Design a protein around this ligand. Structure first.
Ligand SMILES: O=c1ccn([C@@H]2O[C@H](COP(=O)(O)OP(=O)(O)O)[C@@H](O)[C@H]2O)c(=O)[nH]1
Length: 461
């Protein structure tokens, strides 16, 4: 029977997308079969049910019974929620894992960055545990480095005067480290230390990056050390392609490389004030834009938005007349857009992104230069390497209070689409687009790393 792999994503579609591509390439290139075990905290949406019921043939899934979070404070950090989703699911995971081991030749149990507590079931059934790291190699280096870092400094990382030196990475200031390490007293940092200390138990770590993108970190990560698992960089793992919003029909009416795509992520929120400056900044830029807009996290006190203070329609928070005035140049789509297809469209010449790694990789595979606007999670770390190391992103400056003025926005937008500053990022992003195609080619470095992993796992049966 085929060598079988069991995969446990952490809650969140952002983690699921890259894991499904990893499975698809293991199935197509090395004749694996895959089971996706999904913890839940409630009912799944209809869109999720469709995505799951349209998975490839040799890939099935099993949904665990929902965990209850009524005890968690409303201020609970997501990393705490994710971690607790695994521990509170271990009983039902154990039952499901039993049946798989009885019926299939299970050669590996792949968890993601916050699933180390599922190692105990893997060990109990004599299945090699693996970690899929859905983010950057720099972030992966930081995880492996964190037990040492945590012991070298006890103050909050923001208060460190000098930049933190992660092995093999560009120096980065503590204030730019990922969110769950910004408050060392929060359960989120404790959970992160818990998992990172347990990365040594993994037989391997799959990294969603490639060498042309992060040669420094990957080189440091692959240097052997006792207690350090081997690292397989197999990226870019993105849903690579070959419309109820009418986005793509609109893009068909625009010239080539002329539209700035704007998305602040699925969870990214701006202050209403900041949202106003973004809308106004896009108008002052005089460029074409496609903006997937979501509601702001608060409302400005101006009377113009007194009747929509409680509105859930994102379009109600725009400056009055903004849509009328920009109808020819800009398309504003509310809440969700066909991103992958938008970044593949030839009329897209730029992407103002929150620097989520899946969005970043999709933009890299399609060669779309970036304006980096990090918001949460590890996005500030990603912005730094994108702006200062890889140099494929422009970054607007904010005032003392973190407000990016309409003028700075208009400047960076024009800078990316027309200005001298955007010439180099566009060029370097095209070189990375070609690099992404090389590493995923027949003899590419990421295709070979996946084959190295596939060989090790098949040699267990
Ligand atoms: O309007 C949107 C926003 C996001 N995405 C998809 O959601 C993922 C973005 O996740 P990322 O890792 O960039 O950061 P996150 O939003 O998960 O924090 C990518 O697959 C995008 O294509 C999308 O299709 N439409």
């Amino acid at each position: 029977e085929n060598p079988h792999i069991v995969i446990l994503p952490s809650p969140g579609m952002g983690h699921l997308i890259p894991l499904v591509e990893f499975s698809k390439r293991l199935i197509s290139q090395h004749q694996f079969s895959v089971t996706l075990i999904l913890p839940t905290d409630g009912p799944i949406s209809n869109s999720q049910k469709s995505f799951l019921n349209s998975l490839p043939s040799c890939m099935d899934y099993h949904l665990l019974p929902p965990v209850n979070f009524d005890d968690l404070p409303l201020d609970v950090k997501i990393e705490t929620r994710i971690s607790l989703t695994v521990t509170r699911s271990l009983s039902s995971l154990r039952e499901v894992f039993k049946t798989l081991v009885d019926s299939k030749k299970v050669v590996a149990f792949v968890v993601d960055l916050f699933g180390t507590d599922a190692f105990d079931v893997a060990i109990d059934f004599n299945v090699s545990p693996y970690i899929f790291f859905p983010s950057t190699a720099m972030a992966l280096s930081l995880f492996l480095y964190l037990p040492k870092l945590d012991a070298t400094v006890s103050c909050e990382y923001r208060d460190l005067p000098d930049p933190i030196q992660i092995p093999g990475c560009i120096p980065i200031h503590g204030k730019d480290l990922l969110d769950p390490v910004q408050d060392r007293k929060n359960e989120a940092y404790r959970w992160l230390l818990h998992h990172s200390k347990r990365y040594r138990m993994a037989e391997g770590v799959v990294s969603n990056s490639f060498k042309e993108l992060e040669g420094g970190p990957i080189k440091a990560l692959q240097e052997e050390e006792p207690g350090k698992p081997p690292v397989y960089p197999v990226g870019p793992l993105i849903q690579m392609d070959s419309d109820g919003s009418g986005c793509l029909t609109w893009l068909d009416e625009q010239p080539r490389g002329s539209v700035l795509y704007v998305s602040y992520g699925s969870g990214g929120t701006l202050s209403h004030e900041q949202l106003i400056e973004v809308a106004s900044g896009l108008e002052m830029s005089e460029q074409r834009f496609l903006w997937v807009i979501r509601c702001p996290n608060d409302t400005v006190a101006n009377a113009t938005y007194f009747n929509v203070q409680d509105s859930t329609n994102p379009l109600d928070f725009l400056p009055k007349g903004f849509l009328e005035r920009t109808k020819g140049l800009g398309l504003v789509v509310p809440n969700w857009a066909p991103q992958a297809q938008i970044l593949s469209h030839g009329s897209t010449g730029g992407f103002l992104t929150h620097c989520g790694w899946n969005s970043t990789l999709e933009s890299v595979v399609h060669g779309v230069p970036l304006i980096a606007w990090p918001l949460y999670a590890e996005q500030k770390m990603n912005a730094v390497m994108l702006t200062e190391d890889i140099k494929v992103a422009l970054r607007p400056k904010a005032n003392e209070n973190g407000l990016v003025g309409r003028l700075e926005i208009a400047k960076v937008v024009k800078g990316l689409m027309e200005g001298e500053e955007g010439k180099g990022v566009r060029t370097r992003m095209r070189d990375l687009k070609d690099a992404a195609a090389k590493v995923l080619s027949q003899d590419g470095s990421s295709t070979k790393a996946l084959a190295e992993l596939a060989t090790k796992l098949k040699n267990k049966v």
